[PDB]
Amino acid sequence: GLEHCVKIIRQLECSGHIDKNFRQKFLTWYSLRATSQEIRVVKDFIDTFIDDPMALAEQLIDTFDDRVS
Amino acid sequence: GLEHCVKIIRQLECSGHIDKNFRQKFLTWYSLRATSQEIRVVKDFIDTFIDDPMALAEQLIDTFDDRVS
């Protein structure tokens, strides 16, 4: 769950769909703060936007940018 | 796990991406306090930012500086 999330989130950053700031904020939040239920949301989004990294990035931002800041 | 983490953390210090203080604080925290789950986060970050030591350093600081101080 963690391994996979980190890899994808780096991939998005490297591909330019998320900025460095959000990646850093997000990984911190996911690693420590994010609750069991909140991890299930993230896992679920990742699986839904497989071939659509742009839509995934936009979704993670829309859902979690407030919580991670 | 420990051996590898220590080597990387020293490498970052010696390369100037982390200061001496944080290295010392971090090794203490990792050696003694850090929980099973917290070690998995560290291991995972290290593996993600191999070729980007600046980003690794910035990530470890963002995630762990509070816990190690």
UniProtKB/Swiss-Prot annotation, chains A, B:
Signal peptide: none annotated. Induction: By cold (e.g. 4 degrees Celsius). Levels follow a diurnal regulation with an accumulation during the dark period and reduced levels upon exposure to light (at protein level). It is found in: Nucleus. Disruption phenotype: Delayed flowering in short days but not in long days conditions, associated with high expression of MAF5, a floral repressor, due to a reduced H3K9me2 status of MAF5 locus. Residues 1-69 are annotated as: VIN3-Interacting Domain (VID). Maybe involved in both the vernalization and photoperiod pathways by regulating gene expression. Binds preferentially to dimethylated histone H3 'Lys-9' (H3K9me2). Promotes flowering in non-inductive photoperiods (e.g. short days) through the maintenance of the epigenetically repressed state of MAF5 via H3K9me2 and plant homeodomain / polycomb repressive complex 2 (PHD-PRC2)-dependent H3K27me3. Self-interacts. Interacts with VIN3 and VIL1. Component of the plant homeodomain / polycomb repressive complex 2 (PHD-PRC2) large complex during prolonged cold, composed of core PRC2 components (VRN2, EZA1, FIE and MSI1), and three related PHD finger proteins (VIL1, VIL2 and VIN3) that mediates histone H3 trimethylation on 'Lys-27' (H3K27me3). This is VIN3-like protein 2. The gene is VIL2.
